[PDB]
Amino acid sequence: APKYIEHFSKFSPSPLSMKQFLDFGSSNACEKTSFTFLRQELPVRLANIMKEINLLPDRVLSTPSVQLVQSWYVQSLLDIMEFLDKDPEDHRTLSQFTDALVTIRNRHNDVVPTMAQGVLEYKDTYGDDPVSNQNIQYFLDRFYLSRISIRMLINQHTLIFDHPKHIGSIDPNCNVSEVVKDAYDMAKLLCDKYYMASPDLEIQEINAANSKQPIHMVYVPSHLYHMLFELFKNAMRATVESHESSLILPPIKVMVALGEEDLSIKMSDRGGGVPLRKIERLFSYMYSTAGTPLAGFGYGLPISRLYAKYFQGDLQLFSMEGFGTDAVIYLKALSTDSVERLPV
Amino acid sequence: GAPKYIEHFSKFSPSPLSMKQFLDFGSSNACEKTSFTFLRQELPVRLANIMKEINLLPDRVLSTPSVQLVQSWYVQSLLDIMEFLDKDPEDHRTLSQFTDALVTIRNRHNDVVPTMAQGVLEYKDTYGDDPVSNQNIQYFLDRFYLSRISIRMLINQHTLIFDGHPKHIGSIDPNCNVSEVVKDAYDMAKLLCDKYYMASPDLEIQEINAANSKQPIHMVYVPSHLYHMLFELFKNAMRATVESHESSLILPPIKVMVALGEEDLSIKMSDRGGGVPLRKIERLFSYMYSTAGTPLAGFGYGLPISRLYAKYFQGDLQLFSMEGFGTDAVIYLKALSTDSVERLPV
Numbered sequence: 001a002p003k004y005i006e007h008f009s010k011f012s013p014s015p016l017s018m019k020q021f022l023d024f025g026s027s028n029a030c031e032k033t034s035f036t037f038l039r040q041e042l043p044v045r046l047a048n049i050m051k052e053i054n055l056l057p058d059r060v061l062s063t064p065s066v067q068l069v070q071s072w073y074v075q076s077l078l079d080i081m082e083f084l085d086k087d088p089e090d091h092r093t094l095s096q097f098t099d100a101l102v103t104i105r106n107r108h109n110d111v112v113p114t115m116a117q118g119v120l121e122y123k124d125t126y127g128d129d130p131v132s133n134q135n136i137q138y139f140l141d142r143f144y145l146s147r148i149s150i151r152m153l154i155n156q157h158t159l160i161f162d163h164p165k166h167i168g169s170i171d172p173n174c175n176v177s178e179v180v181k182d183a184y185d186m187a188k189l190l191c192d193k194y195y196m197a198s199p200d201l202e203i204q205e206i207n208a209a210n211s212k213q214p215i216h217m218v219y220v221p222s223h224l225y226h227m228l229f230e231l232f233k234n235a236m237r238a239t240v241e242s243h244e245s246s247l248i249l250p251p252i253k254v255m256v257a258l259g260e261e262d263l264s265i266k267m268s269d270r271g272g273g274v275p276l277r278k279i280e281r282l283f284s285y286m287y288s289t290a291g292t293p294l295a296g297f298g299y300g301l302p303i304s305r306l307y308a309k310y311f312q313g314d315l316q317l318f319s320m321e322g323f324g325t326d327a328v329i330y331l332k333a334l335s336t337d338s339v340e341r342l343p344v
Numbered sequence: 345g346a347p348k349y350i351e352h353f354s355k356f357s358p359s360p361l362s363m364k365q366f367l368d369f370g371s372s373n374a375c376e377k378t379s380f381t382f383l384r385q386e387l388p389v390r391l392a393n394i395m396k397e398i399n400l401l402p403d404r405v406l407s408t409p410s411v412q413l414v415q416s417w418y419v420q421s422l423l424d425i426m427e428f429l430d431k432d433p434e435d436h437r438t439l440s441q442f443t444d445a446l447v448t449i450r451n452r453h454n455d456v457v458p459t460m461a462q463g464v465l466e467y468k469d470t471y472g473d474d475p476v477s478n479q480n481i482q483y484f485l486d487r488f489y490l491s492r493i494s495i496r497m498l499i500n501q502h503t504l505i506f507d508g509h510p511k512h513i514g515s516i517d518p519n520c521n522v523s524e525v526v527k528d529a530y531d532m533a534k535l536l537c538d539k540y541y542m543a544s545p546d547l548e549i550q551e552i553n554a555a556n557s558k559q560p561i562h563m564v565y566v567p568s569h570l571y572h573m574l575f576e577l578f579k580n581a582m583r584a585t586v587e588s589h590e591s592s593l594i595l596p597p598i599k600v601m602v603a604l605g606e607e608d609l610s611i612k613m614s615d616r617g618g619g620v621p622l623r624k625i626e627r628l629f630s631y632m633y634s635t636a637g638t639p640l641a642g643f644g645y646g647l648p649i650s651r652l653y654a655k656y657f658q659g660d661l662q663l664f665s666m667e668g669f670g671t672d673a674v675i676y677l678k679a680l681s682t683d684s685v686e687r688l689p690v
């Protein structure tokens with residue numbers, strides 16, 4: 001296993017473009033090609049994340065939760081190693097490979113909260129929240145983004161080779177407003193259940209080049225949903241908790257803008273805002289302004305920002321203390337600008 | 345005599361002053377002899393530290409005629425203040441000579457910003473060089489121009505208080521009505537916009553005083569600093585708005601929100617000038633980068649200098665755009681005088 005990790009960590013993960021994802025999940029989709037690609041690329045990506053995990057201080061690495069996560073990565077690498085000698089022409093190989101990728105995806109379902117638990121186990125033993133937080137911040141960004149990239153490759157294979165007009169998890173005609181409404185509907189269910197009130201949603205679209213046209217892009221809807229759902233939970237909590245005695249809640253306003261290069265989604269709340277001093281902290285792992293279902297374990301904003309960065313986007317927060325907050329997701333408008341951002 | 349004076353005074357660190365200290369020392373109890381004995385130590389300390397900052401430039405930028413000229417001004421200004429070290433504070437003519445000397449220094453340095461910019465262009469005309477030295481230049485110029493804002497603030501306080509509108513403590517308005525400064529900046533930008541384009545967007549101002557909803561928003565601030573930032577942001581918003589609506593009879597207005605929270609006084613300026621792609625935002629804050637003769641465009645110094653004015657009393661200035669719609673520029677100031685302290689580079 002240390003042998004496999006050293007061999008595969010000699011290679012660099014290969015960033016894939018949206019055009020490649022669409023081409024390889026198209027009419028010409030060949031399962032044998034996907035198999036011979038992934039039995040090289042997934043060990044490369046697994047070995048590079050296992051190297052990233054070994055760049056943690058020995059005291060974080062020795063926590064039971066981090067050792068558990070490490071044991072999963074080892075097991076997953078060994079599962080794929082079983083396929084290196086197997087024959088792509090044999091339909092049993094291809095079927096076993098798909099089953100193995102489903103097993104790996106399922107084994108890693110709770111990586112995010114488990115890795116979070118290891119960071120808390122480090123505090124329960126050393127009793128300290130000092131300047132090693134910048135090192136952990138840096139590592140967890142790289143770790144969780146690498147993981148988004150591995151699950152993207154596994155989802156593409158299992159969806160294609162095991163709505164219906166998608167290419168695996170990609171919707172080439174992703175209606176951005178529809179995903180906004182879906183995220184809002186699900187946040188609103190949680191908000192209504194706990195607070196018995198929720199703000200309304202207003203959506204405005206600005207299609208600069210085509211004023212009357214609904215805004216569509218090539219994107220992974222589940223990634224956009226994740227970001228917007230996390231931002232809606234924040235905007236709805238801020239709005240209801242700042243208007244605890246009001247019959248009238250100010251609405252959440254979403255603008256979807258399509259320019260030449262950027263598709264921008266701004267979510268504006270009137271939840272009372274945050275002082276500028278507190279913004280950088282909101283993007284820290286496990287920092288929380290907060291049981292309300294609208295509050296998590298402080299992972300919503302930093303993970304959501306990784307989803308945005310993954311296809312060359314970004315996620316920014318700008319607040320005005322005493323009024324409210326704007327959260328902006330920046331995506332690449334063009335499929336030809338949309339390439340995996342993999343930690344280097 | 346000069347490299348000796350610079351070494352002696354650079355042993356000291358500039359002392360950050362708070363809004364309470366500025367108000368107290370320009371108050372009822374204002375003593376000119378106290379201001380003199382303070383500034384004849386603090387100004388040489390600040391001059392020596394900026395002259396050290398200038399010597400941290402690569403030899404090729406430092407040897408340009410424009411940078412050598414700026415260096416010669418700082419040297420002459422340090423020597424002018426050195427003449428006062430032995431002079432008697434009890435002699436009222438010492439104090440009058442000191443004020444005259446500070447006016448001379450302020451006037452001598454009036455063109456520092458564009459002269460320093462010329463030295464950066466002289467460096468390109470000789471090397472060609474626009475590569476990876478730009479981050480070093482950016483880093484140095486931020487520290488240089490902010491140190492200069494701080495020296496001019498001290499000189500302006502002394503000459504406005506002790507040389508002789510009327511409720512001000514030197515350049516500080518303890519009851520600075522933020523909306524009034526917004527209107528002043530807008531009126532002046534609008535004159536330039538009308539003169540060149542023969543059209544200008546209207547202004548809408550909304551105030552949100554979270555703790556006191558019906559109260560006008562006031563703070564302790566230096567109006568001329570707030571004016572500078574808002575005037576530069578209005579020029580940008582007006583240019584973007586008119587140049588994206590070159591065939592329209594109707595221009596969308598510029599909207600300003602002034603919000604007062606417990607800790608922050610935030611001023612957002614929102615235009616519908618078509619916005620900028622996210623890739624281009626970082627370079628708007630770069631010295632001498634220009635999206636651009638129109639008086640609404642400069643030599644690419646508006647945003648980075650404006651951000652230094654915001655940083656100087658522990659604020660900030662941020663830009664966020666939506667390509668195809670428009671741009672929000674936010675000035676963040678400290679609401680409370682007790683949080684308002686000089687940010688000095690050492």
Ligand SMILES: O=C1c2ccccc2C(=O)c2c1cccc2-c1cnn(C2CCNCC2)c1
Nearest residue numbers: 014015016017020021024033034036037038156
């Ligand atoms: O299933 C595949 C696939 C699935 C989903 C997205 C992308 C791909 C994909 O890219 C791929 C696949 C199978 C076989 C070969 C490739 C391939 C093409 N170019 N490369 C380059 C990497 C960087 N430069 C050197 C070669 C690898």
Ligand SMILES: O=C1c2ccccc2C(=O)c2c1cccc2-c1cnn(C2CCNCC2)c1
Nearest residue numbers: 359360361362365366369378379380382383501
């Ligand atoms: O004219 C003055 C003045 C004018 C405008 C603003 C501020 C001041 C000012 O503060 C000052 C002045 C004259 C004499 C002394 C002081 C003073 C007070 N404390 N300190 C130092 C204490 C230890 N290190 C940090 C600062 C210096």
